[PDB]
């Protein structure tokens, strides 16, 4: 009933799952297919760059969150709200949130809590859709996501 | 050779490292055990108070300092020196410097940079002893610190 | 290379192309994509407006010009230069230039001369960047273009 929520959930949950398994899963894709796959590709490239850049810091940050089981996922929802509490919204903050979400996903696999991966992606999708519907549409959704992190040139 | 420096670094390191840990270490002290222990207990009471009071402010103040690792420690040293630029030296400024240091220590654990906690305690101790040693001897060292923060017991 | 030329050509060519074919090829643009896409959206809005306003007139004007092939493209260049021959430059004339160009693009498709569409966009892009670059930079390039025609919501 909400294509934006469905599409967003797919991209993010695809990212979180495959980051945990380590296996870059190439079974595409869904309804929109094109944009969704391009969003997952952009998420991988950019996100892995952020995860490599702040791997050291991310480890301590997630450590202090103390995520053990399902109930602790709710603690991450509160964090995601604080990321936008200053009223500022941009693709940089949104993608870093997903990158850190993927970092938690790697962790959940480590402590043998893979069943918490899907509620993790759902919670991320909830905050983004529930609280940033307008910004997402005004920025043209995941098309404005691929448009922002686009790199080309050289001939 | 500098008994004052050793005792100072000992008390400050003990407070900072345990504020970073999230639990208190009660094991005996090096030389004068009684004085140092009493100072650590007093510092715990007052220091935790200062932090609870100015927590919000400390968060932004440290954020602006942009401490990422050990190379940013000397930036803290510049701030500490600047605390004594108007010529006035007292225990309030000293315990607040230590309290802010314990706050920086917790942040260092959050960003997975716990190794910088010892150079943090060292620079805090350095500023106090290198520039304000005459004051510390006059105030009877850590005996005066305990005395200063000693609170009425209601008999 | 010239960054201003690359951007302008991209915007003008895409507009003339989509006005001709009647589609919309919003694929990955250039480096300054945000500006380019906003400018193209503005061009869609204002450009179509100018066209629906003067379409009847444009038909006779282009007819009088008698454009049949790529040799006749240099005739449009003369017209374009003559627009600014009074020393005056503004966004109204510029967007009208491009709007008439889109009208020519459709005509080129009608007479099976779609090969001339790219040289047409080039000529339009040329007279703007080659002869009016100073004004364009002063008006903040395509950023100022979007700003000028922003209304309203």
């Amino acid at each position: 009933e909400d294509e934006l929520y469905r599409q967003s959930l797919e991209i993010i949950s695809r990212y979180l799952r495959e980051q945990a398994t380590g296996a870059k899963d190439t079974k595409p894709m869904g309804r929109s297919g094109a944009t969704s796959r391009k969003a997952l590709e952009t998420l991988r490239r950019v996100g892995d760059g952020v995860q490599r850049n702040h791997e050291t810091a991310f480890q301590g940050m997630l450590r202090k969150l103390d995520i053990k089981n399902e109930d602790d996922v709710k603690s991450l929802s509160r964090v995601m709200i604080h990321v936008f509490s200053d009223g500022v919204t941009n693709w940089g903050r949104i993608v870093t949130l997903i990158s850190f979400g993927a970092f938690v996903a790697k962790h959940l696999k480590t402590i043998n809590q893979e069943s918490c991966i899907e509620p993790l992606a759902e919670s991320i999708t909830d905050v983004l859709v529930r609280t940033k519907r307008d910004w997402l549409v005004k920025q043209r959704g995941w098309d404005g996501f691929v448009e922002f992190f686009h790199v080309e040139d050289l001939e | 050779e500098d008994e004052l420096y050793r005792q100072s670094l000992e008390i400050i390191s003990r407070y900072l490292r345990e504020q970073a840990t999230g639990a208190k270490d009660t094991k005996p002290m090096g030389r004068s055990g009684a004085t140092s222990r009493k100072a650590l207990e007093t510092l715990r009471r007052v220091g935790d108070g200062v932090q609870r009071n100015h927590e919000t402010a400390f968060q932004g103040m440290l954020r602006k300092l942009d401490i990422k690792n050990e190379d940013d420690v000397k930036s803290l040293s510049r701030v500490m020196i600047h605390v004594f630029s108007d010529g006035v030296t007292n225990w309030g400024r000293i315990v607040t410097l230590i309290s802010f240091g314990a706050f920086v220590a917790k942040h260092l654990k959050t960003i997975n940079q716990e190794s910088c906690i010892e150079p943090l305690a060292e620079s805090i101790t350095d500023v106090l002893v290198r520039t304000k040693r005459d004051w510390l001897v006059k105030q009877r060292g850590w005996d005066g610190f305990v005395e200063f923060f000693h609170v009425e017991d209601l008999e | 290379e010239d960054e201003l030329y690359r951007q302008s050509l991209e915007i003008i060519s895409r507009y003339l192309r989509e006005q001709a074919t009647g589609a919309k090829d919003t694929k990955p643009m250039g480096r300054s994509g945000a500006t380019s896409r906003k400018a193209l959206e503005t061009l869609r809005r204002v450009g179509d407006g100018v066209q629906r306003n003067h379409e009847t007139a444009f038909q006779g004007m282009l007819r009088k010009l008698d454009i049949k092939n790529e040799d006749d493209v240099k005739s449009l260049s003369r017209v374009m230069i003559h627009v600014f021959s009074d020393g005056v430059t503004n966004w109204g004339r510029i967007v009208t230039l491009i709007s008439f160009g889109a009208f020519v693009a459709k005509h080129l498709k009608t007479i099976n001369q779609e090969s001339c569409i790219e040289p047409l966009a080039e000529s339009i892009t040329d007279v703007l960047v080659r002869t009016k670059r100073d004004w364009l930079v002063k008006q903040r390039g395509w950023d100022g273009f979007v700003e000028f025609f922003h209304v309203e919501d």
Binding site: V46, V50, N53, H54, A57, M61, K64, L65, S75, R78, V79, M80, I81, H82, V83, S85, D86, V88, N90, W91, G92, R93, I94, V95, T96, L97, F100, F148, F149, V151 | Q59, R63, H107, T110, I111 | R31, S32, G33, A34, T35
Partner: peptide, 26 residues
């Protein structure tokens, strides 16, 4: 506090803005 949502969140903010500056059309 006992729940460190604010520090992590603020840290995430600055990391996000750095990413924003990194890929933004210069």
């Amino acid at each position: 506090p006992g729940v460190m949502t604010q520090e992590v969140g603020q840290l995430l903010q600055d990391m996000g803005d750095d990413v924003y500056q990194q890929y933004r059309s210069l």
